[PDB]
Paper text:
Although we were unable to obtain crystals of C. albicans Aro1, we used cryogenic electron microscopy single particle reconstruction (cryoEM SPR) to investigate the Aro1 structure. Nevertheless, we were able to identify a subgroup of particles corresponding to dimers of full-length Aro1. After 3D classification, we identified 87,484 particles belonging to a stable conformation representing a dimer of full-length Aro1 at resolution of 4.19 Å. In this map, we performed only a rigid body fit of two high-resolution models for Aro1DHQS-EPSPS and Aro1SK-DHQase-DHSD domains. As implied by the crystal structure of isolated Aro1DHQS, dimerization of the full-length cryoEM SPR structure of Aro1 is mediated by extensive contacts between the Aro1DHQS domain, resulting in an arrangement similar to the one observed in C. thermophilum AroM homodimer. Notably, we did not add any ligands to C. albicans Aro1 sample used for our cryo-EM analysis, nor did we observe any evidence of endogenous ligands in the five active sites, in contrast to the crystal structure of C. thermophilum Aro1 that contained numerous ligands. Interestingly, within the Aro1 dimer we observed asymmetry between the monomers, with the Aro1SK-DHQase-DHSD region tilting ∼55° relative to the Aro1DHQS and Aro1EPSPS domains. The Aro1SK-DHQase-DHSD region of subunit 1 is tilted away from the Aro1DHQS-EPSPS region and is referred to as the “loose” monomer, whereas the Aro1SK-DHQase-DHSD region of subunit 2 is nearly parallel to the Aro1DHQS-EPSPS region and is referred to as the “tight” monomer. The Aro1DHQS domain, Aro1EPSPS subdomain II, and Aro1SK-DHQase-DHSD backbones show nearly identical conformation within the core structure of each region with minor differences seen in some loop regions. This implies that the large movement of the Aro1SK-DHQase-DHSD region does not drive structural changes that modulate substrate binding or catalysis, but instead reorients and repositions the domains. However, each individual active site is more than 40 Å from each other and each face outwards from the core of the dimer.
In the human fungal pathogen Candida albicans, ARO1 encodes an essential multi-enzyme that catalyses consecutive steps in the shikimate pathway for biosynthesis of chorismate, a precursor to folate and the aromatic amino acids. In Fungi and Apicomplexa, the second to the sixth steps of the shikimate pathway are supported by five enzymatic domains combined in a single protein known as Aro1 or AroM. Aro1 forms a flexible dimer allowing relative autonomy of enzymatic function of the individual domains. Our activity and in cellulo data suggest that only four of Aro1’s enzymatic domains are functional and essential for viability of C. albicans, whereas the 3-dehydroquinate dehydratase (DHQase) domain is inactive because of active site substitutions.
Author numbering:
A (entry chain A): 988 to 1550
B (entry chain B): 1129 to 1269
C-alpha cells in the first residue's frame, strides 16, 4: 500500500485509457473480467465497435447508490438486457475513485456495454447544473475506462459537446433530451431541432424521452420515428401512460428490476415481453429437438429455462425422428414453427431444407439449427461455436497463437477441426483410433485448414505448440495401443510453450463426466480439462440467440443441464 | 332483422347493388354497419382498396363502416392508427385479425369485438378481462 499510492497521480495521468483488475473469487468472476477485457480492448484499439444492436434490445437501468449492495443478484439483474445504463449522478459518491470502483464491480458480473449517464438536475437527475467542470471530467472517465456508450445532453454547454465529440475515441455518443414537464407534444418543432442537434454533433444514437398525458402521445411518437431515420432513435414517452412507447421501442428500451430503486416506473424484463406478446409482437411458437435416441437430450431443459427467465411465449419439446420427411409434415410446415435443434442421425439430412446455409454449414457438412427466414429456412452449425466458446470461457484467447489436436473421428469431429481453425491455431494435428476414416478429413477440408496427420511416435516430437486439444473418442475404450503413445508425447510439451494460457483439452462426450482421457491430461501432465457439459450449454447458447434473438441467461441455463 | 327491431344491421360492401339499395331503402331506423374483411391478408392500410371501401360506406349512407384487416406484423396495427386519423367522416371500426393484430383490437374505440370462454372462438378475440388488462399494460387505464 506504500508503493502504490504515491504513483497513482503519475499512473492515472500518463494513460489515455485505464483498466481495473481486481481479486476474483469464483471462475465465473475470473471469466467476466477476461471477457470484458476483450470487448474493452476491441474498443480502445478500434477494431470492432458494438454496432447499435439491430434486433430489439433493452438496457437495464442500474439505479443503485452502491452496487456492492446488489452484487450477488447482479447476474439476475442483467437478464435480457443488452446494455447497462449506469446513472452516475445517483451514486453515493461521484468521485473518480468511486465510479471506477462501481465500474469494477460490474465487469466482474456483467459482460455488457456500459451506458455512462451523468444525468443532471434539469433533466431529472441528482447531479447539479451549476458545476459544469465535474460533469466534463466525469464523462472523460467514461472515455478512459473504456465504456461503450457515453451520454452527452443536448441542452448542455457547447464546449462540453465539442469536447466529448472530438475526444470521444471509440466510445460512442448518445444524445438525450428529456421533457421533464410534459409541455411538448410529438409534433412540436423542438423535437425536430433536437434531432438535428444529434445529426450535426454526429452522435451515434439520439434519445428523445417525452412524457405521455394520453395514449395518443405514444402514436405521435411512432409518427415521429418514421419521419426521422438518419441516426438511430431511442424514443419513448414516460409516465404511466407511456408504456406503449417503451414496449414498441426497438433500440435500448430502459428496463429495471425488483431489486433496484425503480423510480421512473420502468418495466421489468418479464413485463416488457409479456406486454409485447399481448399486443402481438411475439407469437406462441414451438421449437423442437429431433433425433433418434432423444429420450435424454437435455436440450429442452436448457431452452425452457431461458424462455421462463425472459417470459417469452415459447415451448421446447422432443420429436423422435429417423427420416427428414416426417419433420417437414409434422413440425416445419405448421404456422407455429419456430425452429429446430437437430441431433446426431439427422444432421446430414436437414441440409436439404436450408435455402441459406452459413459458411460453417458447407465446410462442416452438418446443420444443427434450422430457423425460418423470408422465403425458406436458414441453416447454421453451432457446434463449432460450442467447441470454441468452451475454450474462451476457460481462459483461451479468441485469436491466440498455439496449435491444436483433434483426437478421434467421431460425430463432432469435423466441427472441432473447423472450430480450431477459426480459433487461431496455426496447425491442426489429427490423431485417431484407427486410420481408416483418417485421410477423408483432409480431402474434405481446405488446404488452408492444414490437418497434419500424426502417423508415428517420433512425429509426436515434431508436433509443436499443441495447447488446444479436443478429444472426441467415444469413452468406451480405455486408451491404449498406437493411439495412447501418440497423445502422451503430445501433451507432455504442454505448459512450457506459454502462449498466454494454460494448455486446454475439451472432452466432447457429455455422459461420461470423467473420461479416461480427461484423467490422463489432467492428473498426469497438468492441463486444464473441460467436461462436455460445457459444450452442450455453449452449443445451446448460440441456438438460443438464433431461435429467440435474445442472449440466454447463462446461470439459469447452466443450472438446467447440470442436474 | 329489420322487422324484429335489431339495432345494427350489417350489410357487406361487396354485396350486389340490388341488396345494398334494397336494405338501405327500408331500414327505417336500424343503423347499417358496412363491412369488408381482408380474409387473404395482403392489403396493407395504405392501398386505394381501403379508401374505396370506406367511400362505398359514405356513399350508401352507412352509419358505421367496418374495415377488417389481417396483420402479418406489428406495423399494420400502427398503419391502421394513421388510417383512422385520415378518415373521420363516418364512424369507423378497424382492426387486424390474427395473433399479430392484438394491439389494433386493444386500441379501438367503437365496438371492439370480444369473446368468452363458454362460447366457440375462432378469430382469437380477447375477453373483457384481457382487453382491459392489455389496455392497462399499455397505459390507457
Amino acid at each position: 500500500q506504500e508503493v502504490w499510492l504515491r504513483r497513482e497521480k503519475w499512473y492515472h495521468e500518463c494513460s489515455n485509457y485505464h483498466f481495473y483488475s481486481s481479486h476474483c473469487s469464483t471462475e465465473d468472476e475470473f471469466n467476466h473480467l477476461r471477457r470484458s477485457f476483450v470487448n474493452y480492448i476491441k474498443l480502445i484499439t478500434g477494431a470492432e465497435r458494438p454496432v447499435v444492436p439491430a434486433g430489439r434490445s433493452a438496457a437495464v437501468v442500474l439505479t443503485s447508490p452502491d452496487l456492492n449492495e446488489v452484487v450477488g443478484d447482479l447476474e439476475s439483474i442483467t437478464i435480457g438486457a443488452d446494455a447497462v445504463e449506469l446513472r452516475v449522478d445517483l451514486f453515493k459518491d461521484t468521485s473518480a475513485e468511486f465510479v471506477a470502483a462501481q465500474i469494477a464491480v460490474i465487469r466482474k458480473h456483467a459482460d455488457l456495454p456500459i451506458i455512462y449517464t451523468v444525468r443532471t438536475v434539469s433533466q431529472g437527475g441528482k447531479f447539479p447544473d451549476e458545476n459544469v467542470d465535474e460533469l466534463k471530467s466525469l464523462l472523460l472517465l467514461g472515455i478512459r475506462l473504456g465504456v461503450a456508450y457515453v451520454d452527452l445532453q443536448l441542452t448542455a454547454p457547447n464546449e462540453l459537446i465539442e469536447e466529448i465529440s472530438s475526444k470521444k475515441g471509440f466510445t460512442r455518443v448518445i444524445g438525450t433530451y428529456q421533457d421533464i414537464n410534459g409541455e411538448l407534444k410529438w409534433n412540436n418543432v423542438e423535437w425536430k431541432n433536437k434531432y438535428n442537434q444529434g445529426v450535426s454533433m454526429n452522435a451515434d444514437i439520439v434519445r428523445l424521452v417525452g412524457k405521455a398525458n394520453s395514449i395518443q402521445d405514444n402514436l405521435d411518437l411512432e409518427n415521429f420515428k418514421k419521419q426521422n431515420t438518419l441516426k438511430p432513435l431511442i424514443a419513448f414517452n414516460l409516465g404511466s401512460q407511456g408504456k406503449l412507447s417503451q414496449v414498441l421501442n426497438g433500440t435500448f428500451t430502459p428496463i429495471s428490476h425488483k431489486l433496484l430503486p425503480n423510480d421512473e416506473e420502468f418495466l421489468t424484463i418479464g413485463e416488457l415481453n409479456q406486454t409485447y406478446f399481448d399486443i402481438g409482437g411475439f407469437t406462441a411458437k414451438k421449437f423442437w429437438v429431433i433425433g433418434s435416441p432423444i429420450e435424454h437430450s437435455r436440450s429442452p431443459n436448457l431452452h425452457n429455462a431461458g424462455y421462463k427467465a425472459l417470459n417469452l411465449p415459447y415451448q421446447f419439446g422432443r420429436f423422435e425422428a429417423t427420416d427428414v420427411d416426417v419433420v417437414y409434415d409434422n413440425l416445419i410446415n405448421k404456422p407455429d414453427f419456430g425452429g429446430l435443434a437437430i441431433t446426431m442421425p439427422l444432421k446430414l439430412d436437414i441440409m436439404k431444407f436450408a435455402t441459406k446455409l452459413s459458411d460453417a454449414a458447407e465446410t462442416i457438412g452438418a446443420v444443427n439449427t434450422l430457423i425460418p427466414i423470408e422465403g425458406g429456412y436458414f441453416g447454421d452449425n453451432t457446434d463449432w461455436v460450442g467447441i470454441s466458446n468452451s475454450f474462451i470461457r476457460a481462459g483461451v484467447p479468441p485469436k491466440s497463437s498455439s496449435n491444436g489436436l483433434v483426437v478421434g473421428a467421431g460425430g463432432t469431429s469435423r466441427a472441432a477441426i473447423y472450430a480450431l481453425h477459426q480459433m487461431g491455431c496455426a496447425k491442426i494435428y489429427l490423431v485417431n483410433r484407427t486410420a481408416a476414416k483418417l485421410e477423408e478429413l483432409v480431402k474434405s477440408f481446405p488446404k488452408d485448414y492444414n490437418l497434419e496427420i500424426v502417423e508415428t511416435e517420433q512425429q509426436a516430437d515434431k508436433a509443436s505448440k499443441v495447447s488446444l486439444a479436443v478429444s472426441c473418442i467415444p469413452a468406451d475404450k480405455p486408451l491404449d495401443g498406437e493411439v495412447l503413445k501418440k497423445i502422451e508425447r503430445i501433451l507432455s510439451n504442454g505448459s512450457e510453450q506459454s502462449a498466454g494460457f494454460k494448455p486446454t483439452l475439451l472432452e466432447a462426450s457429455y455422459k461420461p463426466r470423467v473420461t479416461p482421457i480427461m484423467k490422463l491430461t489432467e492428473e498426469q501432465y497438468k492441463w486444464k480439462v473441460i467436461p462436455g457439459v460445457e459444450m452442450l450449454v455453449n452449443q445451446g447458447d448460440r441456438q438460443f440467440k438464433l431461435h429467440t434473438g435474445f442472449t440466454a441467461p447463462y446461470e439459469i441455463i447452466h443450472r438446467a443441464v447440470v442436474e
